[PDB]
Amino acid sequence: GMVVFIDPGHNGANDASIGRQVPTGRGGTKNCQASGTSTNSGYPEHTFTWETGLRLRAALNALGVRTALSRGNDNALGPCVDERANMANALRPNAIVSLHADGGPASGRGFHVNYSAPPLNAIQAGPSVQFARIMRDQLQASGIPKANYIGQDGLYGRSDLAGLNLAQYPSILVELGNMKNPADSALMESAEGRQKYANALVRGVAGFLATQG
Numbered sequence: 001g002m003v004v005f006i007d008p009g010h011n012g013a014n015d016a017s018i019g020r021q022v023p024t025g026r027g028g029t030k031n032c033q034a035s036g037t038s039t040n041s042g043y044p045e046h047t048f049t050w051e052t053g054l055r056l057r058a059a060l061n062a063l064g065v066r067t068a069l070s071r072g073n074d075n076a077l078g079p080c081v082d083e084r085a086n087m088a089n090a091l092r093p094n095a096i097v098s099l100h101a102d103g104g105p106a107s108g109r110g111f112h113v114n115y116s117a118p119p120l121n122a123i124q125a126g127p128s129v130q131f132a133r134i135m136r137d138q139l140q141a142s143g144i145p146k147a148n149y150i151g152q153d154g155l156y157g158r159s160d161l162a163g164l165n166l167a168q169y170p171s172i173l174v175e176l177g178n179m180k181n182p183a184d185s186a187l188m189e190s191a192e193g194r195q196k197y198a199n200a201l202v203r204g205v206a207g208f209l210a211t212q213g
């Protein structure tokens with residue numbers, strides 16, 4: 001009955017086409033994709049989101065939740081941000097979760113959950129805000145601190161992310177940590193750390209799904 005769309009942020013590989021302009025959902029355009037960041041050791045964001053995304057997929061499949069991925073590999077060109085949102089909407093999912101990692105100041109540590117604000121539809125106004133709050137409480141529960149450098153108590157309501165703007169179904173974009181920070185990068189570079197993030201993500205997704213039914 002349940003369908004969740006998981007979006008491991010960024011592509012396995014990029015070419016010049018990532019510079020092509022795509023609609024933002026509020027007028028104007030932005031680049032199709034961004035390369036993403038990396039840890040000081042060179043562990044790329046695209047691989048972190050992909051590996052953590054697979055763990056989240058495994059956890060949701062254990063609950064009998066049908067999952068869809070925004071991309072099927074971590075080594076080739078992937079879809080633009082507008083295509084990912086249109087792909088997700090076409091599935092009429094119960095929840096959409098995008099996974100990212102940030103590139104912030106070295107002392108900046110912790111997570112932030114991004115959601116579309118001001119809202120462009122009733123789903124963005126209510127259910128997506130409830131989903132963001134639930135997810136923020138779950139990451140804090142896995143021992144991931146609320147970001148000390150961005151957002152408000154681990155939340156960031158914002159208008160500039162095309163994927164969030166274009167969503168017709170509950171959708172959030174989770175920045176799991178700062179790849180440039182020693183504590184967050186040590187978690188990201190470890191299979192146990194990636195599993196810890198996936199456990200928080202499944203708890204947030206399940207918690208939200210349990211309120212909508």
Ligand SMILES: [Cl-]
Binds near residue numbers: 120121122123
């Ligand atoms: Cl509406």
Ligand SMILES: [Cl-]
Binds near residue numbers: 153
């Ligand atoms: Cl709050």
Ligand SMILES: [Cl-]
Binds near residue numbers: 030081160
């Ligand atoms: Cl975007």
Ligand SMILES: [Cl-]
Binds near residue numbers: 081162163164
């Ligand atoms: Cl986006």
Ligand SMILES: [Pt+2]
Binds near residue numbers: 002064
């Ligand atoms: Pt189910």
Ligand SMILES: [Pt+2]
Binds near residue numbers: 079083084087
């Ligand atoms: Pt697609």
Ligand SMILES: [Pt+2]
Binds near residue numbers: 161162163
């Ligand atoms: Pt974006």
Ligand SMILES: [Zn+2]
Binds near residue numbers: 009010036037045101
């Ligand atoms: Zn990113």
